[PDB]
Nucleic acid binder design. Structure first.
Ligand SMILES: [Mg+2]
Ligand SMILES: [Mg+2]
Ligand SMILES: [Mg+2]
Ligand SMILES: [Mg+2]
Ligand SMILES: [Mg+2]
Ligand SMILES: [Mg+2]
Ligand SMILES: [Mg+2]
Ligand SMILES: [Mg+2]
Ligand SMILES: [Mg+2]
Ligand SMILES: [Mg+2]
Ligand SMILES: [Mg+2]
Ligand SMILES: [Mg+2]
Ligand SMILES: [Mg+2]
Ligand SMILES: [Mg+2]
Ligand SMILES: [Mg+2]
Ligand SMILES: [Mg+2]
Ligand SMILES: [Mg+2]
Ligand SMILES: [Mg+2]
Ligand SMILES: [Mg+2]
Ligand SMILES: [Mg+2]
Ligand SMILES: [Mg+2]
Ligand SMILES: [Mg+2]
Ligand SMILES: [Mg+2]
Ligand SMILES: [Zn+2]
Ligand SMILES: [Zn+2]
Lengths: 72, 101, 97, 79, 124, 55
RNA sequence: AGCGUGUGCCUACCCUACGCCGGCAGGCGCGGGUAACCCGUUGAACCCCAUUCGUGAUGGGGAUCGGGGAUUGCAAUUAUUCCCCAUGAACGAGGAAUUCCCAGUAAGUGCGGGUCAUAAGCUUGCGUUGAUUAAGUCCCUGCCC
RNA sequence: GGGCACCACCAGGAGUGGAGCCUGCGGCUUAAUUUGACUCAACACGGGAAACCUCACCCGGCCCGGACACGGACAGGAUUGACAGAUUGAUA
């Protein structure tokens, strides 16, 4: 027997393309003229994600991308 | 002085009987008390298969067979003399097991 | 193939320590028996050894279900330069004990 | 625990068959003739019969020192 | 005229727990419930309940589709629209009170009934 | 995720949980005495294993 | 009775004695066996001795269906298998044609192994009961000199 | 023109071909009802007793397990995974 093609489905299921963001570190910190630094993003309460691993400021929740911890 | 049992397992009878005779002679040369060798019933493993790698032709079968023979020897003696006589006993194809009951 | 760098480090360290490698050709095996407590899947070992083979660093044999890999001289040099090992370290194979 | 005598003898035969196949594939180039396994409670010795032993040994004995390694890795009995 | 399942009407069935319903069912359904339901069946139940809650007071609930042909029909499913996969299409089934204790796959047939044609040359 | 779905189907019994120890074929398998070979591989290696034809 | 199997590299899945519960399929405990050691003195079926039936598609036969219960599995519906009540079809020895077989044989009757989580109307072996006919030919079929 | 054979006959036994059912093979249906084999020397044969796997057929959806070499892009980030809501047969 020979293989039939039958090439017809939903036109194209596209693959997710990751967003390109330039200098994402900067928006985590706010700066005053005096030289102070304030951390805009919350720090996760988990063990590993404690100091430099910031959370996600979603419109209705806080989300840590490293351990899937979520808060209201 | 221990009651020591030697179990000999083999696939061919000539080597097994040669080893048993060697052990008996060696032990009796030391003026020891030997019982046996007592021969257990022979075991016969059988595998029946089809000859053809496919399912075509006359239905012919191969009958493969393996035979296992077993001997027992009893000795009233200390451990050291048994190991003395056993060291020589090493033979290709014969499994020798020494136990103290 | 994508894998954490520590898995590659462990595989290469084991290979350079022993000089040989054995695998079972089982992509679904949760972890390599030899690489225990380091959590290296068997698939990672297979693919890393394949990558080494394609570059000529290891020689390969296959028997009845198993992969056997031996380390080549250029593979020895590559592993020594990769792991930053001193020139006074050789695999256990190269020692006539 | 332990296994029965039937399983023990079948396992020994299967081990010998696999060892022979591996040695055949490895040493066909060297005129590999056969393998003889002598089991002793101290060590299990393997005798390789081939037309020329120089290629099997290798330089300074490297190649054979490799083989006795992978065998130990394959069947798992201790170093 | 009023529906009763082994002498029990629908309201009492809806009030009963799973342990009480085990004794009403037959041996197969009782054994299945004793072995427990897994995550997928609970998800299907949750989706059916959510769909039935949002129905208008005089309208039918939205059809919920599923591949679970071995799902047992519980008394809480009566009155829901379920599309059951038969391997090719989702067949729409409305759960009636007399379906309690059957499987979902018993109501979506997996083959086309045979209408025979003229036998060919190779038949003797 | 994919990690859960991939190879999730249980394989603790059946033809899918057993294969030949030489060629990884699941058909015509011999399990007696723990051989775990297909019939063709067994016929190929019987003399090496130690099965002799006497009848 | 006899031949055999039994706790498995991956690999999860063994054979079961005894006590109690259930009417049965089964469920609980608690032991032995890696085996001439435990299942096991393998209390097998046909066969044998009594009882009922009485030439009636009959108490022969057991297909097809209804309602219940239990086990294997992740999952039993298009019924996995098993058990219990109920239902009770054709079939009264088979046309033309055609198969196998010469002594512990043919046939009857059970029991192991393979497949096997669940598992035999198949196959491969083993016993038990045990014959009629023949010690010839080239007529049919076929193959050689 | 001879010789031989119970996969030939003769003298027989048990039969099969008839019934119900179980299983293979054709047909006919189907989205698919995967496929090999057709006189002995195909048809309870492929050790083929398939609920899933087996699986090779149909419907739908993930994954790369595309080595290595060259070029591009890249620590001002090449790429990886994921909570909620939507979506989905599905907690892909
Ligand atoms: Mg009647
Ligand atoms: Mg009757
Ligand atoms: Mg019923
Ligand atoms: Mg069907
Ligand atoms: Mg009845
Ligand atoms: Mg004829
Ligand atoms: Mg039988
Ligand atoms: Mg069976
Ligand atoms: Mg069959
Ligand atoms: Mg003639
Ligand atoms: Mg006649
Ligand atoms: Mg008959
Ligand atoms: Mg007849
Ligand atoms: Mg008939
Ligand atoms: Mg036909
Ligand atoms: Mg095909
Ligand atoms: Mg012929
Ligand atoms: Mg077929
Ligand atoms: Mg079946
Ligand atoms: Mg199903
Ligand atoms: Mg599936
Ligand atoms: Mg299938
Ligand atoms: Mg990728
Ligand atoms: Zn965190
Ligand atoms: Zn094979």
């Amino acid at each position: 027997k020979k293989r039939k093609k039958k090439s017809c489905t939903t036109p194209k299921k596209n693959k997710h393309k990751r967003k390109k963001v330039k200098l994402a570190v900067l928006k985590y910190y706010k700066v005053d003229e005096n030289g102070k630094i304030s951390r805009l993003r919350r720090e996760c309460p988990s063990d590993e994600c404690g100091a430099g691993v910031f959370m996600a400021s979603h419109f209705d929740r806080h989300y840590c991308g490293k351990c899937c911890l979520t808060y209201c | 002085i221990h009651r020591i049992r030697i179990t000999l397992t083999s696939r061919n009878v000539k080597s097994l009987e040669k080893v048993c005779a060697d052990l008996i002679r060696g032990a009796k040369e030391k003026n020891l008390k030997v019982k046996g060798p007592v021969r257990m019933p022979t075991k016969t493993l059988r595998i029946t298969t089809r000859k053809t790698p496919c399912g075509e032709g006359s239905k012919t079968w191969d009958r493969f067979q393996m035979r296992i023979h077993k001997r027992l020897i009893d000795l009233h003696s200390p451990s050291e003399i048994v190991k003395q006589i056993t060291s020589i006993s090493i033979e290709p194809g014969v499994e020798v097991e020494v136990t103290i009951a | 193939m994508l894998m954490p760098k520590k898995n590659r480090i462990a595989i290469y360290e084991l290979l350079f320590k022993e000089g040989v490698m054995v695998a079972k050709k089982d992509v679904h095996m949760p972890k390599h028996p030899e690489l225990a407590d380091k959590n290296v899947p068997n698939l990672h070992v297979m693919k890393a050894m394949q990558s080494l083979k394609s570059r000529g660093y290891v020689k390969e044999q296959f028997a009845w279900r198993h992969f056997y890999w031996y380390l080549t001289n250029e593979g020895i040099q590559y592993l020594r330069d990769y792991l930053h090992l001193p020139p006074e370290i050789v695999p256990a194979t190269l020692r006539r004990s | 625990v332990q296994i029965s005598k039937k399983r023990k003898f079948v396992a020994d035969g299967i081990f010998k068959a696999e060892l022979n196949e591996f040695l055949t594939r490895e040493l066909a180039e060297d005129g590999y003739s056969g393998v003889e396994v002598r089991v002793t409670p101290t060590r299990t010795e393997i005798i390789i019969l081939a037309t020329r032993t120089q290629n099997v040994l290798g330089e300074k004995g490297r190649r054979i020192r490799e083989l006795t390694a992978v065998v130990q890795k394959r069947f798992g009995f201790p170093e | 005229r009023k529906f009763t399942y082994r002498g029990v009407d629908l309201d009492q069935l809806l009030d009963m727990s799973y342990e009480q319903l085990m004794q009403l069912y037959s041996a197969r359904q009782r054994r299945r419930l004793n072995r427990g339901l897994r995550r997928k069946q609970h998800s299907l139940l949750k989706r059916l309940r959510k769909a039935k809650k949002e129905a208008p007071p005089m309208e039918k609930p939205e059809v919920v589709k599923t591949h679970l042909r071995d799902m047992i029909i519980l008394p809480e499913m009566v009155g829901s629209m379920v599309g059951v996969y038969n391997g090719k299409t989702f067949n729409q089934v409305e759960i009636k009170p007399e379906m309690i204790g059957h499987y979902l796959g018993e109501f979506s047939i997996t083959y086309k009934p045979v209408k025979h044609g003229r036998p060919g040359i190779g038949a003797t | 995720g994919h990690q859960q779905l991939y190879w999730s189907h249980p394989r603790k019994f059946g033809q899918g949980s057993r294969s030949c120890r030489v060629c990884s074929n699941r058909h015509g398998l011999i399990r007696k005495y723990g051989l775990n070979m297909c019939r063709q591989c067994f016929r190929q290696y019987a003399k090496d294993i130690g099965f002799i034809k006497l009848d």
